[PDB]
Amino acid sequence: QELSRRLQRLYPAVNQHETPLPRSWSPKDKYNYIGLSQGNLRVHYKGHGKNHKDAASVRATHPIPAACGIYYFEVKIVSKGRDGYMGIGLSAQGVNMNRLPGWDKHSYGYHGDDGHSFCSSGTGQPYGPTFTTGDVIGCCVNLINGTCFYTKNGHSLGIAFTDLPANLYPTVGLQTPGEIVDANFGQQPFLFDIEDYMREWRAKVQ
């Protein structure tokens, strides 16, 4: 399997038997307005999406193991759908899936339509560019420091969150009809050179 070899390469300190890595979205752990396809890697919004009370998220199958040191995943925007109310980020296991990532306690999100970050809060802060159909958004979590930065189309955007709690799950949320996103948990090469980033972080850490 190219997948297991890739993941062993990226995260050699991880005991995938004690703490398996997220490899796809959970077929269970999602709100009913979310549909899945393509081996649980594609996420479709299928609610009415009238307003933010129709937001809907999905969590990956497992939380990010601490021993990753630095973890990384990428999401491609297949379609913005109607409004592109799409959130990408991290959620703890108890987080309500009837919300976009970042709105609730222990939830962290970067949203496409405003480019704002949401740090366990219903109110966004200016963070990055907007994103839409065709864009690739990555999420890089530093488990050692408890920090997270995002990437857009291969380019890093700076730390969005600090003081992150342990055991967070990769999460995406959608809101409007037509919204579709694809996830890469390591199945294929990332746009962002994450291995080189890990070398640079070790090189520059103070």
UniProtKB/Swiss-Prot annotation:
It comes from the Eukaryota. Residues 3-190 form the B30.2/SPRY domain. Expressed at highest levels in spleen and liver. Expressed in megakaryocytes and platelets (at protein level). Coiled coil: none annotated. Disruption phenotype: Mutant mice are viable and show no conspicuous phenotype. They have normal platelet counts and only slightly reduced proplatelet formation. Resting platelets tend to have a more spherical shape. Many platelets exhibit disorders in microtubule filament numbers and localization. The animals show a markedly prolonged bleeding time. Granule release is also reduced. It is found in: Cytoplasm; Nucleus. May act as an adapter protein to couple membrane receptors to intracellular signaling pathways. Core component of the CTLH E3 ubiquitin-protein ligase complex that selectively accepts ubiquitin from UBE2H and mediates ubiquitination and subsequent proteasomal degradation of the transcription factor HBP1. Enhances dihydrotestosterone-induced transactivation activity of AR, as well as dexamethasone-induced transactivation activity of NR3C1, but does not affect estrogen-induced transactivation. Acts as a guanine nucleotide exchange factor (GEF) for RAN GTPase. Belongs to the RANBP9/10 family. May form homodimers. Identified in the CTLH complex that contains GID4, RANBP9 and/or RANBP10, MKLN1, MAEA, RMND5A (or alternatively its paralog RMND5B), GID8, ARMC8, WDR26 and YPEL5. Within this complex, MAEA, RMND5A (or alternatively its paralog RMND5B), GID8, WDR26, and RANBP9 and/or RANBP10 form the catalytic core, while GID4, MKLN1, ARMC8 and YPEL5 have ancillary roles. Interacts with RAN and RANBP9. Interacts with the HGF receptor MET. Interacts with AR. Interacts with TUBB1. Interacts with YPEL5. May interact with TUBB5. Interacts with DDX4. This is Ran-binding protein 10. The gene is Ranbp10.
